[PDB]
Design a protein around this ligand. Structure first.
Ligand SMILES: CCCCCCCCCCCCCCCCCC(=O)OC[C@H](COP(=O)([O-])OCC(O)COP(=O)([O-])OC[C@@H](COC(=O)CCCCCCCCCCCCCCCCC)OC(=O)CCCCCCCCCCCCCCCCC)OC(=O)CCCCCCCCCCCCCCCCC
Ligand SMILES: CCCCCCCCCCCCCCCCCC(=O)OC[C@H](COP(=O)([O-])OCC(O)COP(=O)([O-])OC[C@@H](COC(=O)CCCCCCCCCCCCCCCCC)OC(=O)CCCCCCCCCCCCCCCCC)OC(=O)CCCCCCCCCCCCCCCCC
Ligand SMILES: CCCCCCCCCCCCCCCCCC(=O)OC[C@H](COP(=O)([O-])OCC(O)COP(=O)([O-])OC[C@@H](COC(=O)CCCCCCCCCCCCCCCCC)OC(=O)CCCCCCCCCCCCCCCCC)OC(=O)CCCCCCCCCCCCCCCCC
Ligand SMILES: CCCCCCCCCCCCCCCCCC(=O)OC[C@H](COP(=O)([O-])OCC(O)COP(=O)([O-])OC[C@@H](COC(=O)CCCCCCCCCCCCCCCCC)OC(=O)CCCCCCCCCCCCCCCCC)OC(=O)CCCCCCCCCCCCCCCCC
Ligand SMILES: CCCCCCCCCCCCCCCCCC(=O)OC[C@H](COP(=O)([O-])OCC[N+](C)(C)C)OC(=O)CCCCCCCCCCCCCCCCC
Ligand SMILES: CCCCCCCCCCCCCCCCCC(=O)OC[C@H](COP(=O)([O-])OCC[N+](C)(C)C)OC(=O)CCCCCCCCCCCCCCCCC
Ligand code: HEM
Ligand code: HEM
Ligand SMILES: O=C1C(O)=C([C@H]2CC[C@H](c3ccc(Cl)cc3)CC2)C(=O)c2ccccc21
Ligand code: FES
Lengths: 360, 40, 192, 328, 366, 74
């Protein structure tokens, strides 16, 4: 397995002009490994009982040596997982990477779905108000089929049984992640990476000396920033309301998911029909999947240059990003008619600019 | 094409295009037309 | 006899299509129905002056400047991961091929440095079609193979020879045929 | 391969020029071709008849060879302890073996009467063969002994039935038992995720209504969900009834009198029909407002605005007395 | 075959093969065809000859007067290149389509080089003749000679001789030719040497063809086809296009050198051959004398001169033979033998006696 | 001749129709696999259905197993 190590991470030859925007994959992998370490060492002291989970998490912070550090590293590294993934996705929307990296793009989408599931399962385990009512909402959202929801819950309502199986599932999924990562990289190195210029070039250079050092530099920056936020708390990434014990008969008066879930939340606020809600997610994900075979949707021969530099027309990916940010903004606010109106405007933009990527 | 091993992505292409046509039809019926017929 | 009956359906339809065949070139029917042709023809004076005109001019300005900064031509944007263009590149003569290689090298280096070229290096037309005679030949050659070999879904032996058996001809290009060896030094397909 | 040899000097095991463990008598030929002749001139023990185990020829080599504590096996042949610089000279008069080292580092091959190049030619390892070789070494003609049965007594010949049906029936039988068992396993595993036998969700309750005041909303617990009981004011009633004229416009039309069999008493399940949140006091229609996505309900329970698809659900209930109600 | 129109299936299912299925409608009263050769000519120069014997399969062939004896120091190997390019891309068909169509019609087709002729031919049912005449004439009317086909076809130029290394008899044939006419005309080799792969560029091929492939140097021959249809479909082939214009070429007489040559290899016999020249060749009047004498001696029977006077009187010869090869204007005639390699000096003596007494014959043998 | 070359060129004009025929053939070979897998789907999902639907779908052959417990109460 050493010979493979050398073939793929030492003698592998890249293009000279790979700048930082091509370093974020490595970064998400590293946040995965790190999150796994802190996960396992958190599991050694966590209690999976509805009667006492909350106090179990508080015991780590209050009465255990370095107890606070692992919880906070685990909490904060999640945000960086998602931030790095979104940068990593947008880079390849910008470049039209999926033109020839077909199966890599598919694998990517599967990994993103895995990550969403993993995060949301994690989000229930500390067992506060937000955890209980979030679980209630998302389980009610997948109700269309009889008996599936009491079965997956384990029970007529969110329960200790639900906590136990969420804990086991959150244990298992990351490692399935890892396996799919190996699959991802297989498809990638089958083809070879693209340039920022989107041309084919013979001016290649080996990995170990030049690109490995850039990977290391960015890694230093990321470790830095994680520790900064973890130790000092600069930003209010997580809302305070998960600090309150659960009550099964009273909701919290103000509700804000974790930031990486706000856009979705915005949709659930503005579309009238609940099924329309769910279908928007399904449709957008199907549209992203459809990009894998964009070469077939037209008989003009395709190029990777999108000529977005100096261009007054901008590009659909940029409009997508700004629409998504606008949806995050509206996600965060209270339900009111005007917020809903601009919500619907932004939602139409978000859907249309995704549909239109296929129309070259 | 002849002499190529990719055989399962074309099927997924057709299924996806199908499914989007489906979803948009149903969404037009659900979110717009049925209410519209209450306003007509 | 179900199969022969559906055969009959297919055969009659094909004979209809055959009977209508011309014996010489006939111009294609328009791409748009008469309604949309009418509407476009009506709205032309406003739409072309205010919107389409400037859009199509800005586009060429953007493209030209980006190509001139780097010293590329337009036909340097196509890849060889595209079968037709791969054939076209196989059919090229020495000089054109060498010049393309050189331009791609220079473009890579310049995009690495992110430095403009002097304006006196940018005095050329980037949109010359230097690949066309070869792309058309490639299209012909690759169309005839589909006609004469690809007209059916052929049946094969599965997972033998390093190929899945559903059509591939290069070993280990798919995941279920990864890792061909467990001992030894391996090998390469090009040295068989 | 991954396996070493163990050629080394050893003080427990003397070299084979010193102490051979095999029986050290060998015949020698001037040219190995001559070994052909002996194969067609000797007698052989396997060409002759014996009937009892006691008649089998006795081994030439002695039982008494290897000694030492806890050594089960008492007989061996070959060892790889290393030779010295000056080996022990073989005595060819006793038919001892001369091979490798003992040819190179010894005078054994020397003859007064003969050129050296001729003399050395007789000491290749093909020129030596043990005593008893032609008489005892077997050379089979087949793997099958004529005293055992081969396919000839088991072959199904002319006149036989066809057995494909039987073979494939055998294997189909195996498989359908297998599949039944597999399905049973999956069914049990699925069932194991289902709700436990202690829960049962059964029960009923009753409520006393004397302490309630006009305009107040009381909340109670029923089958795992909250239930609202409200003593409506005359103006609440009027608000509900004024919107009966606009029933045309509603997403889930219903008239107030059905929802309040006693007009001044309003009863509902306290849960949002959208995704399960619990509506709060207020909203635009003096009823209830859900904070999770913004649905509004009127003073009768009806959905007036927002994403929720139906009115607040009526629980199965009865007024037991003027001042007491039954749930379930 | 997009579906099929006929649904009746196997209409003779279950009928044994010793039970007839012919109806009286399918009986006929036999009329023979007429089978003397018919001779015609197109206006551009092409000569046509035809016969019919009422067989169901036809034989079609185009003959061109372009052998290897017409090459020179700048041309050596060009004829082999042309033959190795037969049924390649032409003006209106590609190589792939051509060969695939010939396969699917069911036919067998090919091209052959000699020292004086080049031949193309095909064969299948006679009802397909109109579809085969184009594909045969194409090769001489308008080939394209695209570079990437020449380059891909090169290895077949070397395999042609690599296989001769395990065909001793043919090998000796070639040795005889190159020794008899050293370095001229019939002497030239039938293959591309290493020195012959330089001038493998389209201009040399094309310039060579412009000197030989004109219509008046050609013949088209057909067997089992109706002559007026053959004439019609041949005329319809040359009517639109300009053929290669005529040329008043001249041919030099072969110079016979003779000589001697040896080539050793582990074969377990001494193979030997001796030969003399036939003055005038096929155009000499004595074409029948040599062909009778070859049968007196013994061709490639058991009452022949060699069989009686050599093979039955010596233990150490495996085979003795007389050979006779003729060309338009010269030939050779001689003897060939395989012997025990320890007795070659006796083999020469036997051959010398035999040559000694060919001059005289008795009427029984004659 | 122009006529023959035209016929040869036109021989493959209907490529798409032949490909549709191929679709038909392969799907005809493939689609019967739906019966085994359909039976197994139904096998697994039968005990999830209401008792009445189990009784109905088996035309009254299926009934609650009798194991000697939970009998009527006088
Ligand atoms: C809430 C609202 C929103 C809802 C969501 C809406 C989402 C909509 C958007 C959808 C996005 C895309 C989804 C995937 C589409 C895939 C299309 C496809 O077929 O692509 C062909 C395409 C190649 O086609 P081709 O180019 O024609 O090549 C021809 C070759 O002959 C082909 O051979 P090859 O060797 O070249 O290719 C590899 C081959 C062979 O690959 C392998 O052998 C790899 C095996 C790895 C196993 C590792 C364990 C994985 C366990 C499942 C994890 C699921 C996580 C899901 C995330 C949410 C979690 C809550 O795999 C395939 O060909 C693909 C098979 C189908 C994959 C389906 C993946 C999704 C469903 C999987 C779970 C099913 C549910 C039950 C289990 C759930 C358990 C949690 O393949 C890909 O691109 C696949 C990339 C890898 C992604 C999948 C990785 C997982 C593989 C799972 C295999 C099935 C077993 C599952 C476990 C069962 C036991 C527990
Ligand atoms: C790990 C695997 C295990 C090892 C063994 C391998 C297992 C595979 C066996 C299944 C395949 C049976 C079908 C045989 C077809 C033979 C045809 C032929 O002559 O071959 C040449 C032909 C290709 O030659 P070509 O036509 O020159 O190529 C041009 C292109 O095909 C482009 O052609 P085009 O663009 O002109 O369009 C043509 C297209 C035109 O048609 C369409 O495009 C129709 C689109 C309509 C949309 C509806 C969806 C269509 C797909 C149906 C899927 C249903 C199957 C699943 C049922 C589940 C039951 C529980 O034609 C078709 O779609 C006809 C074939 C469709 C068959 C697909 C389903 C076959 C499965 C049957 C057994 C099902 C039991 C599964 C049990 C559960 C586990 C999976 O072969 C194919 O096209 C292959 C079709 C079959 C798919 C590949 C098999 C998968 C191999 C990778 C394994 C992935 C496993 C992942 C799990 C990993 C676990 C960890
Ligand atoms: C404060 C209190 C203090 C109290 C102090 C008390 C001290 C008492 C000490 C007693 C020491 C006894 C041993 C004396 C050894 C003398 C050696 C000697 O003179 O060597 C000269 C001389 C040495 O020269 P050499 O060159 O080595 O030649 C010898 C050969 O090498 C030999 O090789 P070879 O090839 O010629 O012969 C074949 C070879 C190879 O033979 C085989 O491989 C054959 C194997 C056949 C096995 C078949 C088994 C089948 C049945 C299995 C049943 C299942 C059982 C398992 C399941 C059961 C359930 C659990 O045979 C052997 O290896 C024989 C092995 C005999 C083992 C005897 C072990 C006695 C242990 C006594 C207890 C000691 C303390 C225990 C530990 C205490 C806690 C640390 O050797 C000889 O001449 C031969 C002498 C052999 C003597 C053996 C018999 C000794 C009998 C002693 C009786 C003692 C009675 C004590 C009563 C105490 C009452 C209180
Ligand atoms: C006899 C001589 C000997 C011959 C020897 C020959 C050799 C072969 C042997 C043959 C001898 C007998 C052997 C006995 C075999 C059978 C026993 C057996 O197999 O039991 C198994 C047994 C299973 O027991 P079980 O599951 O408790 O059984 C419960 C029953 O199944 C009860 O379950 P259920 O009642 O819930 O089942 C439900 C069932 C219920 O079934 C029924 O009730 C069907 C009734 C059948 C009636 C029969 C009809 C035929 C007879 C008619 C008579 C004809 C008369 C004419 C002839 C006579 C007069 C001429 O319904 C269905 O299945 C679904 C219905 C059909 C679906 C298809 C949809 C059709 C729709 C209909 C459309 C029509 C319209 C309807 C709509 C209505 C409106 C119009 O094994 C076990 O208990 C488990 C063993 C543990 C082993 C675990 C396996 C290993 C796991 C480890 C894996 C982990 C390691 C990793 C993997 C390792 C991999 C290597
Ligand atoms: C891909 C995942 C599959 C999971 C399998 C579970 C499916 C559900 C439960 C079983 C359903 C019944 C079986 C399927 C039907 C039979 C298949 C079929 O068509 O037959 C093909 C064939 C049937 O062959 P046949 O010769 O009997 O008949 C076919 C020929 N005709 C059609 C002419 C009759 O099966 C085989 O040849 C299989 C060879 C192996 C047989 C022995 C297997 C025993 C188990 C060995 C060890 C297991 C441990 C390894 C597993 C790892 C995990 C622990
Ligand atoms: C491609 C298919 C993949 C299939 C993967 C699915 C595997 C996991 C299956 C889980 C099923 C859970 C069902 C939820 C309902 C509650 C179950 C339960 O225990 O109920 C109590 C019941 C008993 O009821 P009870 O006695 O507890 O009381 C309730 C009474 N009833 C049920 C009437 C309301 O227990 C069971 O019977 C066990 C459930 C068996 C159902 C198994 C379903 C398997 C699904 C696979 C079918 C796949 C077909 C292909 C589809 C593909 C389409 C593209
Ligand atoms: C990509 C990998 C992972 C991600 C993205 C992830 C995500 C999360 C998130 C967002 C939380 C919420 C923490 C909080 O709200 O304070 C969490 C908690 C938790 N995770 Fe994970 N996790 C990952 C891997 C793992 C692994 C591999 C394990 C164990 C093997 C694990 C065990 C836990 C535990 C025990 C908690 C509870 C923390 C607490 O109660 O304070 N995690 N995880
Ligand atoms: C755990 C999640 C992921 C990991 C660990 C990961 C890892 C990597 C790595 C290491 C690379 C090569 C170096 C680099 O580009 O940084 C890469 C490239 C790539 N990834 Fe990911 N990735 C993940 C998620 C995704 C997602 C969600 C997508 C798409 C939606 C995706 C699509 C791609 C593409 C297209 C490339 C190559 C782009 C090009 O070559 O031009 N990946 N990935
Ligand atoms: O009302 C909500 C709500 O709508 C969600 C939502 C956010 C989006 C989630 C989500 C949507 C789509 C995907 Cl693919 C993944 C997660 C589902 C839960 C919450 O997270 C929540 C948490 C606590 C209290 C109330 C609520
Ligand atoms: S859960 Fe009440 S409005 Fe959505």
């Amino acid at each position: 397995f050493m010979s493979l190590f050398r073939a793929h991470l030492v003698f592998y030859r890249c293009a000279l002009n790979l700048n930082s925007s091509y370093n974020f994959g490595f970064l998400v992998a590293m946040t995965f490994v790190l999150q796994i370490i802190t996960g396992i060492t958190l599991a050694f002291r966590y209690t999976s009982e509805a009667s006492c989970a909350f106090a179990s998490v508080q015991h780590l912070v209050r009465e255990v040596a370095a107890g606070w550090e692992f919880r906070m590293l685990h909490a904060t590294t999640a945000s960086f997982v998602f931030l790095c993934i979104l940068i990593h996705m947008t880079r390849g929307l910008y470049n039209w990477s999926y033109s020839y990296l077909t199966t890599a793009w598919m694998s990517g989408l599967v990994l993103y779905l895995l990550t969403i599931a993993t995060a949301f399962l994690g989000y229930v385990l500390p067992w506060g108000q937000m955890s209980f009512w979030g679980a209630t909402v998302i389980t009610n959202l997948l109700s269309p089929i009889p008996y599936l929801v009491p079965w997956l819950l384990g029970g007529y309502y969110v329960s200790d049984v639900t906590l136990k199986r969420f804990f086991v599932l959150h244990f298992i999924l990351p490692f399935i992640g890892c396996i799919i990562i190996v699959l991802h990289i297989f498809y990638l190195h089958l083809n070879g990476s693209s340039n920022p210029a989107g041309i084919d070039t013979a001016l290649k250079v080996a990995f170990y000396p030049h690109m490995l050092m850039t990977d290391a530099k960015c890694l230093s920056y990321l470790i830095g920033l994680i520790f900064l936020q973890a130790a000092f708390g600069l930003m209010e990434l997580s809302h305070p309301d998960n600090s309150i014990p659960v009550n099964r008969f009273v909701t919290p008066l103000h509700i804000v998911p974790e930031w990486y879930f706000l856009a979705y939340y915005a949709v659930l606020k503005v579309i009238p029909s609940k099924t329309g809600g769910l279908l928007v997610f399904m449709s957008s994900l199907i549209n992203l999947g459809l990009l894998s075979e964009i070469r077939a949707l037209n008989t003009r021969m395709l190029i990777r240059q999108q000529f977005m530099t100096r261009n007054v027309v901008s590009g659909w990916v940029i409009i997508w990003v700004y629409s998504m940010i606008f949806l995050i903004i509206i996600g965060s606010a209270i339900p009111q008619a005007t917020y809903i109106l601009y919500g619907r405007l932004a939602t139409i933009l978000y859907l249309t600019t995704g549909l239109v990527l296929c129309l070259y | 094409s002849y002499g190529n091993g990719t055989v399962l992505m074309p099927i997924v292409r057709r299924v996806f295009i199908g499914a989007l046509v489906g979803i948009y039809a149903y969404a037009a019926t659900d979110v717009v037309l049925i209410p519209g017929y209450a306003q007509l | 006899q179900f199969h022969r009956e559906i055969g009959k359906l297919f055969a009659s339809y094909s004979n209809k299509i055959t009977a209508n065949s011309p014996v010489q070139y006939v111009p294609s029917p328009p791409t748009k129905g008469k309604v949309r042709r009418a509407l476009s023809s009506a709205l032309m004076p406003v739409w072309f002056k205010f919107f389409r005109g400037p859009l199509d001019r800005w586009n060429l300005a953007v493209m030209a400047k980006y190509l001139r900064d780097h010293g590329l031509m337009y036909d340097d944007l196509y890849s060889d991961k595209e079968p037709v263009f791969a054939r076209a590149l196989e059919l090229l003569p020495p000089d054109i091929q060498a010049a393309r290689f050189r331009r791609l090298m220079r473009g890579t280096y310049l995009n690495h440095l992110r430095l403009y070229l002097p304006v006196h290096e940018q005095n050329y037309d980037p949109f010359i079609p230097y690949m066309a005679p070869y792309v058309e030949e490639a299209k012909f050659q690759l169309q005839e193979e589909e006609e004469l070999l690809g007209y059916h879904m052929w049946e094969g032996v599965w997972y033998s020879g390093g190929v899945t058996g559903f059509g591939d001809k290069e070993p280990g290009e798919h995941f279920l045929v990864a890792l061909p060896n467990l001992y030894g030094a391996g090998g390469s397909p090009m040295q068989a | 391969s991954v396996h070493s040899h163990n050629i080394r000097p050893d003080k427990h095991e003397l070299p084979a020029s010193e102490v051979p463990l095999y029986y050290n008598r060998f015949d020698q030929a001037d040219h190995p071709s001559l070994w052909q002749l002996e194969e067609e001139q000797q007698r052989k023990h396997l060409d002759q008849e014996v009937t009892d185990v006691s008649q089998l020829v006795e081994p030439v080599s002695s039982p008494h060879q290897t000694e030492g504590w806890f050594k089960r096996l008492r007989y061996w042949h070959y060892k790889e302890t290393a030779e010295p610089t000056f080996p022990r000279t073989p005595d060819l008069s006793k038919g001892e073996l001369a091979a490798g080292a003992t040819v190179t580092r010894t005078s054994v091959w020397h003859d007064p009467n003969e050129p050296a190049i001729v003399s050395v030619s007789r000491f290749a390892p093909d020129n030596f063969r043990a005593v008893g070789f032609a008489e005892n070494v077997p050379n089979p003609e087949s793997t099958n002994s004529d005293s055992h049965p081969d396919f000839r007594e088991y072959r199904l010949g002319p006149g036989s039935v066809d057995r494909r049906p039987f073979v494939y029936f055998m294997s189909a039988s195996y498989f359908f038992i297998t599949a039944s068992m597999m399905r049973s396993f999956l069914c049990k595993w699925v069932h194991y995720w289902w709700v436990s036998r202690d829960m049962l969700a059964a029960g009923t309750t009753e409520v006393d209504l004397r302490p309630i005041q006009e305009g107040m909303t009381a909340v109670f617990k029923w089958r795992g969900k909250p239930v609202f009981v409200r003593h409506r004011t005359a103006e609440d009633i009027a608000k509900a009834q004024a919107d009966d004229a606009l029933i045309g416009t509603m997403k889930d039309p219903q008239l107030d009198s059905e929802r309040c069999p006693r007009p001044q008493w309003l009863i509902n399940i306290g849960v949002c029909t959208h995704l399960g949140c619990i509506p709060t006091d207020g909203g635009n229609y003096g009823g209830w407002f859900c904070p999770c996505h913004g649905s509004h309900y009127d003073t009768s329970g009806r959905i007036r605005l927002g994403p929720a698809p139906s009115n607040l659900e009526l629980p199965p209930t009865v007024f037991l007395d003027d001042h007491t109600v039954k749930l379930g | 075959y997009v579906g099929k129109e006929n649904t009746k299936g196997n209409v003779y299912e279950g009928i044994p093969l010793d039970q007839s299925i012919l109806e009286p409608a399918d009986l006929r009263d036999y009329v023979p065809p007429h089978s003397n050769i018919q001779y015609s000519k197109l206006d551009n120069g092409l000569r046509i000859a035809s016969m019919d014997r009422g067989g169901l399969t036809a034989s079609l062939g185009l003959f061109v007067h372009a052998g290897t004896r017409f090459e020179d120091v700048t041309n050596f190997g060009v004829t082999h290149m042309i033959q190795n390019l037969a049924f390649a891309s032409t003006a209106h068909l590609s190589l792939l389509r051509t060969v695939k169509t010939i396969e699917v019609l069911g036919a067998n087709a090919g091209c052959v080089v000699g020292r004086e002729h080049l031949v193309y031919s095909a064969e299948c049912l006679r009802s397909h003749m109109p579809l085969l005449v184009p594909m045969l004439t194409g090769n001489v009317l308008f080939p394209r000679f695209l570079p990437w086909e020449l380059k891909a076809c090169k290895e077949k130029l070397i395999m042609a001789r690599k296989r001769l290394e395990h065909m001793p008899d043919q090998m000796v044939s070639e040795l005889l030719h190159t020794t008899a006419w050293h370095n001229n005309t019939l002497g030239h080799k039938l293959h591309c040497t290493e020195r012959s792969l330089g001038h493998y560029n389209p201009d040399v091929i094309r310039h060579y063809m412009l000197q030989h492939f004109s219509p008046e140097n050609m013949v088209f021959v057909g067997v089992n086809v109706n002559h007026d249809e053959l004439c019609t479909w041949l005329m319809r082939a040359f009517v639109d296009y300009n053929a290669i214009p005529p040329s008043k070429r001249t041919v030099a007489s072969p110079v016979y050198t003779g000589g001697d040559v040896r080539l050793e290899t582990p074969s377990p016999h001494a193979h030997m051959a001796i030969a003399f020249e036939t003055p005038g060749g096929w155009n000499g009047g004595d074409l029948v004398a040599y062909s009778v004498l070859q049968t007196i001696l013994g061709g490639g029977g058991m009452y022949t001169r060699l069989y009686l006077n050599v093979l039955n009187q010596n233990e150490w010869v495996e085979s003795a033979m007389a050979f006779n090869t003729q060309y338009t204007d010269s030939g050779i005639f001689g003897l060939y033998m395989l012997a025990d390699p320890t007795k070659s000096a006796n083999a020469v003596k036997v051959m010398a006696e035999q040559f000694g007494k060919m001059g005289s014959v008795t009427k029984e043998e004659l | 001749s122009r006529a023959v070359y035209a016929k040869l060129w036109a021989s493959t004009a209907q490529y798409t129709q032949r490909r549709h025929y191929a679709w038909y053939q392969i799907w005809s070979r493939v689609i019967p696999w739906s019966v085994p897998w359909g039976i197994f789907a139904m096998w697994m999902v039968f005990p999830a259905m209401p008792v009445e639907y189990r009784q109905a779908l088996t035309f009254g052959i299926w009934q609650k197993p009798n194991i000697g417990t939970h009998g009527p109460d006088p």
